[PDB]
């Protein structure tokens, strides 16, 4: 599995701060999220930096943005150069130990997985390599991409190193960012127009990610989201204004450990039950993705899951499909699994996308 080090470029360390990972030339993180930052803010890191003056940590604006929020990795703050999107950008690497000097240039493609989540192509003396980190991208949008393409074909990649959450057959096909965020309108649009009294509890993981489909929904219905922390967004309009910290809103996000008991009582992670002594009506609307076989067709992206509870599909990840769309219109050399899927293998995930890769 993926541990932070590419073997074409050795002396950089992507999405893992740990172990081979702190003698690094330079760092790289794709998105900020807890499973790809271990170890970036490790007492050993720490005291590593202290020595080595000349290292830098790399990544989109917003992932700057969002991971300086946080008070525990503001130590970065004097070490961390973000880069344009889609934009390429001279590197230079210097051995500690040794003398060395090592050119890279490096390209930032959307991934499609939260705020600030990129890809990182890599090209330099020893080939061209692409890291996904987390990624969904639909049909179509790879061929999009301008800098993925020479000359009108797609560049030699000499390795993929992906996002293999999906990657078995029976997640053949998930529905689109756009069905998925119609269906959880649609849902919630329904139930807060029949009275100010009815309220959306929706069920979300602690990561970033939900806030496009927060911004839709303000957006759409004009009521701002009840979130537990919202600084994060302080200087990012678009996000910010469409969520509040007030429990006085008709939908909210917020989360507590016992949130699910509090839901079984009729209550609210944030605590709130009547307004006016008025019960609030409250349904539960989870967020989860759903997926079909091959041979089958889309279901209903809202399943209930109880009088007062729904399920509504919504993927952080590429379908089995859109994995194997990818990798046959990048065509590379090789193509490495980041994650094996839980009830999967790793020789199993390699032996699907190998027919996709030229060796
Ligand atoms: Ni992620
Ligand atoms: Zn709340």
Not at 117 to 124: C, D, E, N, R, T
Not at 204 to 216: D, I
Request: glycine share 6%.
């Amino acid at each position: 599995s993926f541990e932070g080090q590419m073997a074409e470029y050795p002396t950089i360390s992507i999405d893992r701060f740990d172990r081979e990972n702190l003698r690094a030339r330079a760092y790289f993180l794709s998105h900020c999220h807890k499973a790809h930052m271990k170890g970036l803010r490790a007492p050993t890191l720490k005291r590593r930096l202290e020595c080595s003056l000349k290292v830098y940590l790399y990544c989109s604006p917003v992932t700057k943005e969002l991971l300086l929020t946080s008070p525990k990795y503001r130590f970065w703050k004097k070490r961390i150069i973000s880069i344009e999107i889609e934009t390429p950008t001279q590197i230079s690497l210097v051995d500690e130990a040794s003398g060395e000097k090592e050119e890279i240039v490096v390209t930032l493609l959307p991934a499609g997985h939260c705020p600030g989540s990129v890809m990182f192509l890599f090209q330099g003396n020893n080939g061209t390599v692409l890291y996904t980190g987390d990624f969904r991208l639909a049909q179509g949008e790879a061929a999009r991409m301008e800098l993925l393409h020479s000359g009108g074909r797609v560049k030699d990649i000499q390795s993929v190193y992906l996002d293999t959450t999906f990657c078995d057959p029976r997640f053949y096909q998930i529905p689109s960012r756009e069905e998925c965020l119609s269906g959880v309108l649609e849902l919630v649009r329904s139930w807060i127009t029949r009275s100010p009294y009815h309220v959306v509890w929706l069920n979300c993981k602690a990561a970033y990610g939900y806030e496009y489909l927060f911004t839709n929904l303000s957006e759409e219905l004009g009521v701002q989201v009840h979130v537990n922390k919202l600084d994060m967004f302080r200087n990012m309009p678009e996000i910010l204004h469409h969520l509040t910290t007030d429990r006085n809103t008709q939908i909210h996000a917020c989360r507590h450990p016992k949130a699910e008991e509090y839901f079984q009582w009729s209550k609210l992670p944030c605590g709130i039950t009547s307004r006016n002594r008025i019960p609030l009506h409250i349904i539960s609307i989870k967020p989860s993705t759903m997926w079909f076989g091959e041979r089958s067709r889309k279901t209903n992206v809202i399943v209930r899951t109880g009088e007062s509870s729904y399920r509504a599909c919504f993927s952080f990840h590429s379908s089995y499909s859109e994995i194997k769309d990818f990798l046959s219109y990048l065509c590379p050399v090789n193509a490495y699994p980041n994650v094996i899927p839980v009830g999967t293998t790793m020789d199993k995930v390699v032996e699907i996308l190998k027919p996709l890769c030229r060796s």
